[PDB]
Structure 1
Amino acid sequence: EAEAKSCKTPPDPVNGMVHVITDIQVGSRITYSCTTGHRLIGHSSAECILSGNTAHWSTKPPICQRIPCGLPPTIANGDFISTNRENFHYGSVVTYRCNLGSRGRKVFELVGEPSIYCTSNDDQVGIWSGPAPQCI
């Protein structure tokens, strides 16, 4: 080189990997992304600007907030188990079931998708897969 000044290589932050496409120095542009299943904080798009002393990205180190998911759609009569209990965040899987008096008994049975898990399909909110399970 000779003179251009680089806005410092963007260090892979909270899970979100940076995409150093063109370069990193002045004029150069890249793109950040919190992989799959993660909300990107700040701005993915960035351009290496320069005030005078040192080159810096017009944006700022993008973060990555974990997509929070609430409780899974509880089916009538059907119970709830698995890892999930209260500390719901994302990905957590839950196994459905159905009443049985108190210790197993021919009284309603789970049918279809006996298990689900946290996911995303509308930003935050933390929408699961679907309340398909049903007692019969």
Structure 2
Amino acid sequence: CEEPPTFEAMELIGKPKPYYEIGERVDYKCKKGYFYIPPLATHTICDRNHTWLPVSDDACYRETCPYIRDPLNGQAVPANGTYEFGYQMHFICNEGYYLIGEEILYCELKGSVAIWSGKPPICEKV
């Protein structure tokens, strides 16, 4: 094999080598900001075909931000229907109330931690 595959959310461990003998095993590690869930494998072996046996980055899942409860007299909703980072959260105030804080929050990955871009707003009576 002359090319250990590259993936979006999982990085090879160690310095890549130009060539690996048949049977050599290469292990990966889930990238900074992603975390492993079993039972999918995160390693591969160079077969007799000079092709790496099938392996995918489905083992690692994106880091998620803390859960937010609905503001009093309000309603929070995952803008993209989940909590993984790089996504946003929307807030809506009921008919009889108005929003006072940030309308939309963005959950961003700082280093290895996903954090919300601010604090949840509140709804105030009109």
TM range (shorter): 0.3 to 0.5
Q: Which has the larger radius of gyration?
A: 1
TM-score (normalised: structure 2): 0.47
- Larger strand share, 1 or 2: 2
